[PDB]
């Protein structure tokens, strides 16, 4: 799982329904901070 950095989903990353979009670093990629 990806609880925390980077996440190219949402489905796969540990935040159920619950994951933000584009933002951080230089080029468009998703956080997940759960």
Same mark, same amino acid.
Not at 11 to 15: G, L
């Given at each position: 799982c990806v609880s925390s950095?980077?996440?190219d989903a949402c489905?796969? *990353? *540990?935040?159920p329904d619950k994951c933000i979009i584009m933002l951080p670093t230089w080029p468009p990629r998703y956080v997940c901070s759960v």
């Open positions: 950095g980077i996440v489905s796969e *990353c *540990c935040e």
